[PDB]
Amino acid sequence: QAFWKAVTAEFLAMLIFVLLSLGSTINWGGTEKPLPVDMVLISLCFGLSIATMVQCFGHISGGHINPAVTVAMVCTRKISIAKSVFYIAAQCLGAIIGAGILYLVTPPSVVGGLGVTMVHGNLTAGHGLLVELIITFQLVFTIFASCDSKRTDVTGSIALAIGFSVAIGHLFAINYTGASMNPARSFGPAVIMGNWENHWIYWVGPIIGAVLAGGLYEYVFCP
Amino acid sequence: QAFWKAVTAEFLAMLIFVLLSLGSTINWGGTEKPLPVDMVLISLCFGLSIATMVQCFGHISGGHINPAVTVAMVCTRKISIAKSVFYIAAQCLGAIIGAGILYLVTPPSVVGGLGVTMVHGNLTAGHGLLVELIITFQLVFTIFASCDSKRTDVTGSIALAIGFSVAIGHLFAINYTGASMNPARSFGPAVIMGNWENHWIYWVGPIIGAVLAGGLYEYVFCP
Amino acid sequence: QAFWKAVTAEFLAMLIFVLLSLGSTINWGGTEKPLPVDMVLISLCFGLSIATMVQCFGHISGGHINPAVTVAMVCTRKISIAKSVFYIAAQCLGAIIGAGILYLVTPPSVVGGLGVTMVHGNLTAGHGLLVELIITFQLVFTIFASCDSKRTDVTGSIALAIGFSVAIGHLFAINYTGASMNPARSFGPAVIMGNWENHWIYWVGPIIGAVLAGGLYEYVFCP
Amino acid sequence: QAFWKAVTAEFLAMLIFVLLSLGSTINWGGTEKPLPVDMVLISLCFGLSIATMVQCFGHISGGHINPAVTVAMVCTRKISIAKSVFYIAAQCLGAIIGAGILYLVTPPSVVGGLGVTMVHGNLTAGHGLLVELIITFQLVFTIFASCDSKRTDVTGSIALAIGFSVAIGHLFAINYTGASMNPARSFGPAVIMGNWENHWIYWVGPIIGAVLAGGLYEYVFCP
Numbered sequence: 001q002a003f004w005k006a007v008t009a010e011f012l013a014m015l016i017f018v019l020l021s022l023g024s025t026i027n028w029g030g031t032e033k034p035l036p037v038d039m040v041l042i043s044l045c046f047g048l049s050i051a052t053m054v055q056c057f058g059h060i061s062g063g064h065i066n067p068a069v070t071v072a073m074v075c076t077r078k079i080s081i082a083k084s085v086f087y088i089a090a091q092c093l094g095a096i097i098g099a100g101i102l103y104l105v106t107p108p109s110v111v112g113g114l115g116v117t118m119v120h121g122n123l124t125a126g127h128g129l130l131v132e133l134i135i136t137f138q139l140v141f142t143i144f145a146s147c148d149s150k151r152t153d154v155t156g157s158i159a160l161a162i163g164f165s166v167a168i169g170h171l172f173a174i175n176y177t178g179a180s181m182n183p184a185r186s187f188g189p190a191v192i193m194g195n196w197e198n199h200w201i202y203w204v205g206p207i208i209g210a211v212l213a214g215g216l217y218e219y220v221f222c223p
Numbered sequence: 224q225a226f227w228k229a230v231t232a233e234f235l236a237m238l239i240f241v242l243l244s245l246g247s248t249i250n251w252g253g254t255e256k257p258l259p260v261d262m263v264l265i266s267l268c269f270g271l272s273i274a275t276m277v278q279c280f281g282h283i284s285g286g287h288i289n290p291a292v293t294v295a296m297v298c299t300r301k302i303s304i305a306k307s308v309f310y311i312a313a314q315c316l317g318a319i320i321g322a323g324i325l326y327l328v329t330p331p332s333v334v335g336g337l338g339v340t341m342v343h344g345n346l347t348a349g350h351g352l353l354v355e356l357i358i359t360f361q362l363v364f365t366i367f368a369s370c371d372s373k374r375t376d377v378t379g380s381i382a383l384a385i386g387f388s389v390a391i392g393h394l395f396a397i398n399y400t401g402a403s404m405n406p407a408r409s410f411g412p413a414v415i416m417g418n419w420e421n422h423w424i425y426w427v428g429p430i431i432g433a434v435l436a437g438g439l440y441e442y443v444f445c446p
Numbered sequence: 447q448a449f450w451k452a453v454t455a456e457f458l459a460m461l462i463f464v465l466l467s468l469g470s471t472i473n474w475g476g477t478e479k480p481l482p483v484d485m486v487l488i489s490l491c492f493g494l495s496i497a498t499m500v501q502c503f504g505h506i507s508g509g510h511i512n513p514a515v516t517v518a519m520v521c522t523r524k525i526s527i528a529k530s531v532f533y534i535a536a537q538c539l540g541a542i543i544g545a546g547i548l549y550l551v552t553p554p555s556v557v558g559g560l561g562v563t564m565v566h567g568n569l570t571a572g573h574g575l576l577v578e579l580i581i582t583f584q585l586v587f588t589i590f591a592s593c594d595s596k597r598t599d600v601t602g603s604i605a606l607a608i609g610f611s612v613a614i615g616h617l618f619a620i621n622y623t624g625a626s627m628n629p630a631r632s633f634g635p636a637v638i639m640g641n642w643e644n645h646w647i648y649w650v651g652p653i654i655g656a657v658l659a660g661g662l663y664e665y666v667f668c669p
Numbered sequence: 670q671a672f673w674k675a676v677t678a679e680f681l682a683m684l685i686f687v688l689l690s691l692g693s694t695i696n697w698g699g700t701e702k703p704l705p706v707d708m709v710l711i712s713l714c715f716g717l718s719i720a721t722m723v724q725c726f727g728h729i730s731g732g733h734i735n736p737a738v739t740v741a742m743v744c745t746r747k748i749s750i751a752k753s754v755f756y757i758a759a760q761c762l763g764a765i766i767g768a769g770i771l772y773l774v775t776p777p778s779v780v781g782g783l784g785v786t787m788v789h790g791n792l793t794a795g796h797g798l799l800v801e802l803i804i805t806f807q808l809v810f811t812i813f814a815s816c817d818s819k820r821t822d823v824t825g826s827i828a829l830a831i832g833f834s835v836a837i838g839h840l841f842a843i844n845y846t847g848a849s850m851n852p853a854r855s856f857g858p859a860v861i862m863g864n865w866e867n868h869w870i871y872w873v874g875p876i877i878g879a880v881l882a883g884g885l886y887e888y889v890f891c892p
Contacts (some may be wrong), residue, residue, distance in 0.1 A: 005666075005667060011610075016584050017579070017585075018613070019580065019618075020584070020614050020617070020618045021618075021620040023619070023622075024617045024618050026621075028621050035482075036258075038485060039261060039484050040261065040263050040267070040709070041263075041485050041486055041489075043267075043616055044486070044489075044613070044614075044617065045617040045618065048610045048614045048617075049614050049615060051610060052584065052588055052607070052610060052611050052614055055588060055591060055607045056549065056584070056587050056588050056591045057591075058599060059597055059598075059599050059668075060667055060668070061256070061434050062608065092494060101571060101580075104573070105480075105573045105576060105577055105622065107568035108567065109568065116322065120330065122330035122332065125329060127327070127328045130324075130328060131328055134239070134242065134324075135243075138238075138239050138243070138275065138279070141279050142275055142279050144279060145279045145280075145282075146278060151282055152282075153281060153282050153381075154381075155379065155380050155381050156379050156380020156381070156382065156383055156601065156602050156825075156826070157380065157601050157602020157603065157606070157607065157825070158599075158601050158602070159601075159605070159607070159608075160380070160383070160602055160610075161274075161278045161382070161383075163273070163610075164271045164274060164383075164386075165273060165275050167267070167271060168243050168267075168268055168271050168272050168275055169243070170245045171243070171264060171267065171268040171271075171523060172242075172243045172244075172247050172268065173244040173246070175249075175251050176246075176328065180594070188519075190252060205227055214669075217521065220228075221228060221232065221283055221284070222282075252864065254789075259704075262707060262710050263486070263709050263713070266710075266713075292698020328794075343777065345776035346774070346776060348853055349775045350773070353770075354774055357685070357688065357768065357770075358689075360685075361685050361689070361721065361725070364725050365721055365724060365725050367725075368724060368725045368728075369724060374728055375728075376727060376728050376827075378825065378826050378827050378828075379602075379603070379825050379828065379829055380602070383722045383826070384721070384826065384827070384828070384829075386765060387717045387829075387832075388719060388720060388721050389743070390713070390716055390717060391689050391713075391718050391721055392689070393695045394689070394710060394713065394714040395688075395689045395690075395692040395693050395714065395715075396692070398697050399692075399774065409793065443867075444674060444678065444729055445728075445729070445803045447697050451726070451889075451890060455890065460774060462803070462806075462807050464842045465803065465841075466804075466807070466838070466840070467841075469841040469845075470841050470844070471838045472844075474844050479849050481705075484708060484709065486709050487708050487712075488708055488837070488838060489707070490712075490837075490840065491837055491840040491841065494833045494836060494837050494840075495837050497830075498807065498811055498833060498837055500806070500809050501811060501814060501815060501830045502811050502814045503814075504822060505814075505820055505821075505822050505891075506890055506891070547799075547803075550796070551792070551796045551799060551800055551845065553789065553791035553792060557792065601824065602824065602825050603824050603825020603829070603830065604822075604824050604825070605824075605825065605830070606825055606829070606830075606833075609833075
């Protein structure tokens with residue numbers, strides 16, 4: 001069954017993306033002498049991991065690797081309802097296992113928050129929701145524009161274009177909200193570490209931005 | 224009307240480019256303990272944001288995302304006069320809204336200059352004009368060479384080539400003039416923060432470099 | 447003979463990859479005042495070196511540049527047994543010469559460990575084996591997915607996709623195990639410097655991950 | 670005349686490459702409080718500048734942008750003797766003007782060495798020659814392999830492949846010899862600043878590596 005292979009591919013792609021990207025945010029200086037946070041390190045690891053998984057799994061399941069983008073294909077009627085519920089569950093379970101593996105191999109002195117997205121202390125959760133909405137809007141718009149069959153002027157690697165869209169979201173919003181733009185990426189480490197503060201903005205935010213991006217492209221710009 | 228969709232696309236592309244790129248230049252250490260400025264952080268965010276917006280909006284409006292490059296298409300008779308005045312206004316308004324959104328979500332202690340381009344204290348404004356002229360000249364030349372229909376040996380992603388041209392301009396001229404090469408990118412935060420020092424070099428500079436680049440390519444090198 | 451040219455190409459590609467990548471990990475601050483380790487420096491040098499050698503030598507020998515990936519083509523029956531033993535020996539000898547050249551030109555005060563992969567002090571060798579297994583699994587899967595003739599939706603540079611897969615492995619596992627994912631890359635400097643601690647995990651790890659990746663792609667996902 | 674346009678293109682491409690890349694190496698901390706040298710900053714600026722100029726000027730003059738690579742096309746009989754002497758002179762004059770412009774706009778307190786390549790104090794000039802030879806060998810081999818008409822499996826941007834080859838040379842050899850791999854890039858600032866120490870290794874080194882790379886590819890690997 002091609003459907004079972006697509007669900008397995010989504011689960012495996014999420015697991016690798018979460019393990020590699022959340023591992024790169026580990027502060028190896030520890031709580032004693034924390035090292036300065038390398039923003040280029042985190043931004044490229046997240047962005048290129050997405051570009052790697054889309055290259056690896058694009059032709060098997062579509063390479064959504066995101067619950068927010070999965071919801072957008074339902075609002076645009078590109079995938080079925082039955083496919084979405086299995087896609088989202090696989091993404092959520094892949095992040096839980098991926099974060100769980102990272103917690104097992106990471107030394108206890110450098111675990112820290114295990115990459116849990118948090119709103120800045122001086123940032124209101126209302127401002128946090130807006131930041132996550134926009135960064136996901138630019139990501140979903142890029143995916144829709146990069147995968148439009150009617151287009152002809154599309155050049156280069158589609159996966160690399162999607163990855164850099166993720167990278168610029170991190171280069172902006174790491175110190176605002178953590179630059180999640182992926183409900184599964186935030187759900188994974190939150191389950192493992194039990195940090196549940198302002199978690200709803202990481203579901204409401206990316207999903208609203210995804211639906212707005214998909215609807216604008218499919219029904220306004222290129223109908 | 225396809226014209227209204229092109230004007231809207233230019234406004235939206237500018238808004239995302241300004242918000243994400245100017246947000247990355249925020250010094251989160253504040254005025255108390257400023258952190259060292261990460262030049263790779265700013266350069267890639269600006270460059271890849273342009274590569275993202277050209278990928279997103281190239282087939283809708285042409286993806287100018289710059290008043291300077293818009294003027295070049297008029298001098299080369301690639302766009303009409305009526306299209307340019309609506310393009311420039313949309314770019315200017317998109318940067319104002321994009322910078323205004325950033326000012327709303329940025330904590331007051333880390334706002335700083337809000338990404339306003341400034342000439343170096345030891346740099347004469349005459350030297351500042353020359354620096355901006357050249358970095359815009361290499362950007363417009365790349366765009367013209369990447370979008371030449373008569374060429375055959377063009378390979379790879381056109382948007383990624385345009386983005387790296389922006390990135391190398393930042394890797395050079397951040398500490399000279401701020402590496403603007405975009406009159407709208409400088410006009411936006413200047414309106415919000417009311418910093419208007421040496422603002423004319425960010426219009427005269429990029430425009431002269433753009434016109435020189437477009438004329439040299441279209442009428443001297445590849446007529 | 448085309449076979450002799452392929453063996454020579456593998457030897458030369460490994461030599462350049464080892465010399466350039468291991469040179470970038472040299473801490474020029476020395477043992478007196480060590481400089482902070484630049485992770486982006488090491489990650490991109492390793493990743494782009496692979497993308498450079500695949501571009502240079504892909505059409506001559508296939509551009510394996512890795513004993514682990516060479517074993518995967520045998521388990522998938524893409525290369526012959528006789529070709530593999532000559533490929534692995536050339537890779538091992540290329541890394542020894544490449545590391546030997548680096549040791550000759552590097553000043554004695556900054557030689558340090560000469561890029562020998564080591565397990566973290568707080569990391570158990572069992573955890574070290576798991577980390578190396580996964581990072582090689584994502585690398586071999588990318589290579590197999592990027593070089594599948596049956597695929598049609600493959601876009602962009604194949605070599606650049608393979609390089610970024612290496613880069614994200616380094617951005618994750620430099621402080622865990624050294625992010626080897628290449629038995630030859632670890633065998634080379636180990637011979638020169640005589641550091642042989644936990645060396646078996648750099649052969650058992652990458653090979654098991656390579657075989658699992660090749661078998662899953664060729665016999666489960668895309669049979 | 671197409672010949673005059675090719676010579677002008679080589680002069681202009683060299684001028685932009687030298688000005689932007691040498692500007693990025695300026696230590697803005699000055700001699701009072703020097704800032705730590707950002708290696709990723711210098712490596713990407715040099716590499717992406719080459720990728721930008723090849724994209725800009727590849728179809729006009731071939732985009733050599735290097736005296737060493739120009740000599741390789743003569744040894745391989747890809748260009749004529751008369752074309753080479755005009756190409757090399759344009760490259761040398763472009764670097765002199767490009768470095769001269771940079772010296773004019775750079776504040777006197779941060780000029781420093783103006784990007785002059787120097788051998789490390791603990792490095793023997795004999796070791797310096799070897800380092801420059803190899804990094805140019807991998808650059809010329811990439812150019813020859815990326816521009817082989819007989820090849821079919823070439824994918825992605827050719828200019829981006831050439832740029833990353835330059836970038837990995839810098840990520841290795843900045844602290845060894847300065848990572849010149851371009852006789853013009855070293856000749857330019859040397860004339861302006863009058864620093865002439867071990868200058869011969871920056872001509873003998875890159876040229877020997879270029880000739881070895883071109884001969885091996887054209888007459889041994891792919892005859």
